[PDB]
Amino acid sequence: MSLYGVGLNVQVDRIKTEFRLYVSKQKGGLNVRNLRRIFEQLDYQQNGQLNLDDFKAGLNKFGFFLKNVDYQCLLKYFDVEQNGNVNYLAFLSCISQTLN
Amino acid sequence: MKRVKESYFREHPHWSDINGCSGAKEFEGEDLAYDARIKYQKETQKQWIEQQIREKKMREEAERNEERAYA
Amino acid sequence: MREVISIHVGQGGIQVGNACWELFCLEHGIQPDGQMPSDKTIGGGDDAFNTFFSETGAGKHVPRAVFLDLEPTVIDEVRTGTYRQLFHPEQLISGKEDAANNFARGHYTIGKEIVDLCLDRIRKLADNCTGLQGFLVFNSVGGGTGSGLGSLLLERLSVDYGKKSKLGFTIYPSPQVSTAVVEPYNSILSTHSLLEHTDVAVMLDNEAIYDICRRNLDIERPTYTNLNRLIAQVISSLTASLRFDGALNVDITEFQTNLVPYPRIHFMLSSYAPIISAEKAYHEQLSVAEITNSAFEPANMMAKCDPRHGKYMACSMMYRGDVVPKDVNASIATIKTKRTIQFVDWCPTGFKVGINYQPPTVVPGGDLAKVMRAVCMISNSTAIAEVFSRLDHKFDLMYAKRAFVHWYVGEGMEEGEFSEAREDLAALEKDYEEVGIET
Amino acid sequence: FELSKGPHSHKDFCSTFGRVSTSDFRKKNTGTMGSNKLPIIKPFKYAD
Amino acid sequence: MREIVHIQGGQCGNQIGAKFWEVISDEHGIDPTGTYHGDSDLQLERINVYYNEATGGRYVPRAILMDLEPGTMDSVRAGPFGQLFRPDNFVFGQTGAGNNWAKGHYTEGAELIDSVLDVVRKEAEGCDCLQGFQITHSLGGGTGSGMGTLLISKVREEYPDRIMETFSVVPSPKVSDTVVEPYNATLSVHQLVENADECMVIDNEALYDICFRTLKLTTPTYGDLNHLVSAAMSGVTCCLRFPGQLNSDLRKLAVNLIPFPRLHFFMIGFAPLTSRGSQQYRALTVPELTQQMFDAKNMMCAADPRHGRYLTASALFRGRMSTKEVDEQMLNVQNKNSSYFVEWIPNNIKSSICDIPPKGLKMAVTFVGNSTAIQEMFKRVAEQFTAMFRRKAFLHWYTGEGMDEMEFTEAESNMNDLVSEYQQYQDATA
Amino acid sequence: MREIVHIQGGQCGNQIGAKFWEVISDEHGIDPTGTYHGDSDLQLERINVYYNEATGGRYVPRAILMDLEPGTMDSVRAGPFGQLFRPDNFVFGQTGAGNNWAKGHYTEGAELIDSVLDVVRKEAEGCDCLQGFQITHSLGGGTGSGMGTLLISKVREEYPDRIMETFSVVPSPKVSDTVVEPYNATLSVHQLVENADECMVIDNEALYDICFRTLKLTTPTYGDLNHLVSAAMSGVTCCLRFPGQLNSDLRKLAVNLIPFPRLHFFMIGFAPLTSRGSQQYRALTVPELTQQMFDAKNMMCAADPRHGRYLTASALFRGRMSTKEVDEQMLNVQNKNSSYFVEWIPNNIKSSICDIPPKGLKMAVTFVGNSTAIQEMFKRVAEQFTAMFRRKAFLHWYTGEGMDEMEFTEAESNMNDLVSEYQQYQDATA
Numbered sequence A: 001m002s003l004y005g006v007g008l009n010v011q012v013d014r015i016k017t018e019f020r021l022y023v024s025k026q027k028g029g030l031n032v033r034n035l036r037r038i039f040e041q042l043d044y045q046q047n048g049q050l051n052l053d054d055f056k057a058g059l060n061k062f063g064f065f066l067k068n069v070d071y072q073c074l075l076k077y078f079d080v081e082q083n084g085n086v087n088y089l090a091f092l093s094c095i096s097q098t099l100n
Numbered sequence B: 001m002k003r004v005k006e007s008y009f010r011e012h013p014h015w016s017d018i019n020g021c022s023g024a025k026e027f028e029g030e031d032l033a034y035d036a037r038i039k040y041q042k043e044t045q046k047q048w049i050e051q052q053i054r055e056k057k058m059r060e061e062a063e064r065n066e067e068r069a070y071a
Numbered sequence C: 001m002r003e004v005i006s007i008h009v010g011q012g013g014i015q016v017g018n019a020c021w022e023l024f025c026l027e028h029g030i031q032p033d034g035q036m037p038s039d040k041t042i043g044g045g046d047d048a049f050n051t052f053f054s055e056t057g058a059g060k061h062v063p064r065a066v067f068l069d070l071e072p073t074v075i076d077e078v079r080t081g082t083y084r085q086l087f088h089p090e091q092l093i094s095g096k097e098d099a100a101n102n103f104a105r106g107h108y109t110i111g112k113e114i115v116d117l118c119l120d121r122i123r124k125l126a127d128n129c130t131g132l133q134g135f136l137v138f139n140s141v142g143g144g145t146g147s148g149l150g151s152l153l154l155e156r157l158s159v160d161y162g163k164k165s166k167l168g169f170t171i172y173p174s175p176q177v178s179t180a181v182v183e184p185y186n187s188i189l190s191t192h193s194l195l196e197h198t199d200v201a202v203m204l205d206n207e208a209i210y211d212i213c214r215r216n217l218d219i220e221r222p223t224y225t226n227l228n229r230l231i232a233q234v235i236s237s238l239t240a241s242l243r244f245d246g247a248l249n250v251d252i253t254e255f256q257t258n259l260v261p262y263p264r265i266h267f268m269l270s271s272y273a274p275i276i277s278a279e280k281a282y283h284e285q286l287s288v289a290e291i292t293n294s295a296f297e298p299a300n301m302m303a304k305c306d307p308r309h310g311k312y313m314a315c316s317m318m319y320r321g322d323v324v325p326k327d328v329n330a331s332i333a334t335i336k337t338k339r340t341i342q343f344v345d346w347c348p349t350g351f352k353v354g355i356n357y358q359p360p361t362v363v364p365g366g367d368l369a370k371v372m373r374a375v376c377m378i379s380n381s382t383a384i385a386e387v388f389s390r391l392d393h394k395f396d397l398m399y400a401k402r403a404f405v406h407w408y409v410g411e412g413m414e415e416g417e418f419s420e421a422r423e424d425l426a427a428l429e430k431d432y433e434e435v436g437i438e439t
Numbered sequence D: 001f002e003l004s005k006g007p008h009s010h011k012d013f014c015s016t017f018g019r020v021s022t023s024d025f026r027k028k029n030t031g032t033m034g035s036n037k038l039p040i041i042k043p044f045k046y047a048d
Numbered sequence E, F: 001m002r003e004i005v006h007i008q009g010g011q012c013g014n015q016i017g018a019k020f021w022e023v024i025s026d027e028h029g030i031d032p033t034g035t036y037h038g039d040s041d042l043q044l045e046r047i048n049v050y051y052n053e054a055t056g057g058r059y060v061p062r063a064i065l066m067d068l069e070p071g072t073m074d075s076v077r078a079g080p081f082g083q084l085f086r087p088d089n090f091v092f093g094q095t096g097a098g099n100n101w102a103k104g105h106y107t108e109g110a111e112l113i114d115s116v117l118d119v120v121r122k123e124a125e126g127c128d129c130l131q132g133f134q135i136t137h138s139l140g141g142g143t144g145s146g147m148g149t150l151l152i153s154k155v156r157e158e159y160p161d162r163i164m165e166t167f168s169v170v171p172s173p174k175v176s177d178t179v180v181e182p183y184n185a186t187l188s189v190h191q192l193v194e195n196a197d198e199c200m201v202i203d204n205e206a207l208y209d210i211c212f213r214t215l216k217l218t219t220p221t222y223g224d225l226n227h228l229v230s231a232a233m234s235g236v237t238c239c240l241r242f243p244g245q246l247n248s249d250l251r252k253l254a255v256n257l258i259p260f261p262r263l264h265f266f267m268i269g270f271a272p273l274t275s276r277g278s279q280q281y282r283a284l285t286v287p288e289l290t291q292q293m294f295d296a297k298n299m300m301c302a303a304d305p306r307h308g309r310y311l312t313a314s315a316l317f318r319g320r321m322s323t324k325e326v327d328e329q330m331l332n333v334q335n336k337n338s339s340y341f342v343e344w345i346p347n348n349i350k351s352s353i354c355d356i357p358p359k360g361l362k363m364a365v366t367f368v369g370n371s372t373a374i375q376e377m378f379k380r381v382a383e384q385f386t387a388m389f390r391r392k393a394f395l396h397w398y399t400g401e402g403m404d405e406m407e408f409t410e411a412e413s414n415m416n417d418l419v420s421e422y423q424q425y426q427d428a429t430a
Ligand SMILES: Nc1nc2c(ncn2[C@@H]2O[C@H](COP(=O)(O)OP(=O)(O)OP(=O)(O)O)[C@@H](O)[C@H]2O)c(=O)[nH]1
Pocket: C009, C010, C011, C012, C013, C015, C071, C099, C100, C101, C140, C142, C143, C144, C145, C146, C171, C172, C173, C179, C180, C183, C206, C224, C225, C227, C228, E245, E246, E247
């Protein structure tokens, strides 16, 4: 919301926290590599990209469900090539810390 | 009209199936496939939705594409 | 075979429906899309989901939630929110025009055109149910939209379900922290409506819940999102006995037959404890002894009414966690000893006690610190007269100059409606003082 | 039977294409929002 | 849903249109070409409230531009965002106004009113569920007042329940923009009071006063003054468009702001405002926000707000904010300034929350309240009106197009009457 | 099957002809040579409707051209698409009428019936199952109304079971072309009421009113006016020639629009039409079709359709669309405007849907309606006639070629009575 200024950062600032916080709460078999491993299934051509339907689909299997608006900010920031495609590799490269 | 099936699902048992029927100790009214049958029924229909929801989408798409084509 | 139906009318409830139901699903772990990944459960078998959900035939699990609102903005957000996959499409009903904070509009303008479906929607849901335990009505008294429809909803319920018990949670205006400029009017009428049509009720004044946040959770800038979770937690405790195994369960039915001296004076207040964030949970013992006493502290009460100005008529407390039966009895024993809490002359025992094993679940990213102790408080005391007094004290003042009266006039309501509102409100308070006088 | 409509209604006389002296005017309080007066008070029952 | 249409009249009425749709266009992210390049769906969740749909996705203003003289209308077309309006919505006469109410209300405007009523009727019936109108017309002009007010009068007759929003520009004596302004002013109010529901009086003095002591800028044009007001309009309409804590439309605003049926003249302002050289040190918090909102000097009406007693007022915050820091602030102000608020209506300030702050900022506020300080405007206009009439000077013109004397006497008494009642509440005590 | 044959009369009759065939030829895909080049099977499915097959592949129109002066049949065959009219059927005398209703209907026309009557009978003998006749004739033209009416008077004499249709161009009041326009106006009308099954009134004043305000084209021409009308006639019978949802033959039009025997005049129009500057910014949805259909300025007649009440009306939807909105939208129009529709004819709008749209667009609709307003046209024509007759002005030209002024008096009584009778039901109630 209000994603004209630092919004692009701020709006994605929350979404990571929910994904970061959500996975920890259940504290179960959730392997941050499951999403990385799942993504190749939808890659098909192994170009490292997926259209919005897949990425929303990819999130559905793991157990992380979000608002419509929150996804919309997702595409804008991570659409590096302005093709409207999210680089899941980029996404998976994120939401992963450097360790204590 | 006719009546071919004792139950809409289970066909009449093979004549060798009733080895007894001497007494009212077997009834086949206990199912033994009820719980299993219900669970399997779920998925069989669900695909039906899975097939249909897509179809309605494409039908809309053909409707949407033409509009721009007119556009 | 036990199920419940919850009615949420008005914006205040609407933001409560999302909050109240989100806790429940996680409680079972019901997946947001409605298709629970399935598990063997840890308490009371796998049937626990029956109370708050019904088998879908294939896939999801639809909550028994029916939403009515006259404005689209708040409602439809659920239609596109994270829980788009939870509620059935045609049970989140929203209208076209906004009440504009007028009760007559809420009670005499757009009733029939939209009230009709609510009965139509509710009836269809009920037919599936078999051993319905009861209904829960949630609405905001000061909310212009809810008061009319709800009262419109409540009045119609009395004839629709009759002996079917009805239980409700309202939100009266705050004594000094106010929102609107005409809230007292529709409030007075709204309470006027519900005096004669609800077996058991509860007050959840906004300010009181506001204060506890700064003292206990140690947060300085809370928003309505923070408030709801607390409301959600209390509700879960109240309904816990229905599904989760317990030594002495307490069904909902044992509220309209145990917590009311008379069918008339049934306005009872609830409390909560313990409420400690893990920031300070490192020090408090969180034992049964201390938690039980905190249930009677004056500051923690869910409404800004001081119990020390009145007596205790009936109080219902049901426990949840790993408490031992012996400790609880000691908890009551000490309380009766205290002179600071004095009970009425004709009530020998004023406590129905409930116990539960399962620890309350934690909402993701919430402010609550999950503990092994919890007490749900429900008390109906003589002190509740004053809350009406202040509302009456306001209502009389404005009427002297007949302010803001025409706009209610032009909605079809007559002017004399107020006279019975003051008298019906007036006819009550004298009742509370009388029963409180010892024989 | 009546189907009494409330705020908006739908029946009209000059709805869509209706329209085909300086002496006249509004005298004192013909306007709707003026007239700082209220109707008479009736007892009402509420008994039902 | 519950959408509204806009009609504007007069150069001041027209001019605001060029800016008014400019800011509204950008808020949802509409470009000069009008194609949708919006980033987030939050810009389209309620787009129909102010736009229709046509082929190619081009979105057209729900505009109705009407005037007596084309020259001012010609200019609005050639500027930026001058291509959104469609020709069919436009109307223009041939004789002009001449700042004479008579030619604007009885003889000239009579002939052209048929088109506007036809064009206005075309838009309303098409819309899903019409919610109300917003009229932006100037009281200081002949065509403005004459055609303008008469437009307000006629509309109410056919529509029973439609709500009305009226933004006017009362002339202040210091900036004598038209010698015939005093006469016109009294005539406009007389017609207005009987049909107008909500009117927000904005003094041009404040716009000039605002431009110097609030923004601290050197050389503003009427665009800036047009810029300042445009923010206020969008300030009130936003809540009806975007998600929020407590949704509140225009009508919801009315019920809490008009204590009696015809004490319905409000006072509006904007904040936070700061200059280029003074907008770096202050701290941007609502507690600082509220401070500038109540301060009299910033209020956009020349009527000093501290000379009267507030009756009703509403607060419409913009952007995110917790309930506490807004509500507690509001409670704080009510108690700490007891003497300035009436005693027979408690908790008499309304607040609401909107979840989309203006683009380029972090927090802002728009205020509308019914204060007795507005009595200063009518009397001073009242005194001026009687002065010119005791000599009949300039009275001949109005009599030159079918008018007659007793109309003026009637209008004067009512306005003298309207001021009479608005003060009897000031000294009233419980 | 059930085809029709056309008879056009007078210069105005011939020129108006020069277009619809051209447009009619366009829809079927008939090239000027007569060689078929359509794209689908549909265009040839019902070619019998307006053409008969001739060896060689080129198609013969069932056209019969009549005019007292050879020029009209000269130019009609010289320009584009003029060679499709086949030379045998051309009929022309040697004299010309000179706008003398007497000359073209007793003096010369009476002498010529032989050949033209012979040819028409044969062509009607050609069709398999006859449907009716269409006619184009000029009431203000002496020959048209003169020769035209006699045949129409003659035609009904032998085809008792065939519906008769007549498009009429009565002179408007504002701009006149002939001074004898009043006289010939009544005489043709008097004979028109007694013989014609359906006569359509089109006012040239409206067309130019239609062109300037809607088409916004700088320089129209009679070709353009012809263009508009030529489309309409194709509008009435379009659904008959193509497969569709609710076939509505011209006769069915007679069923649902004639309340009583003597009220057999309607008013029609064609839409939608877009501008050189608005064609891309309007809307293309069902509401637009209904919004303009009842709009006052679109009806081809000088009579405003609001001065009276519609006794009955019909809308013939052309092209594909959701029938939901076709029926519902009419229910939208009927309810909000009850006062303008008589209250003893419930559900007084006819609707039809055709599956073949006009070449180049998606939606289309043509409108035909019998409204009480038409009384305005006859009165002014009636009023004018009394003005000139009291002074016997220009009486001699008609008295000296076989006539008596008693017939003129007789004509007025019938024309006046129809005007009086036509308005009797407006004040009638149930
Ligand atoms: N507990 C709680 N109460 C709320 C919340 N939001 C609003 N309210 C209450 O709602 C009252 C005003 O009504 P609104 O919330 O604006 O909306 P409403 O109750 O549906 O009434 P309408 O305006 O007619 O729609 C306020 O007095 C608040 O007490 C909330 O988030 N939590």
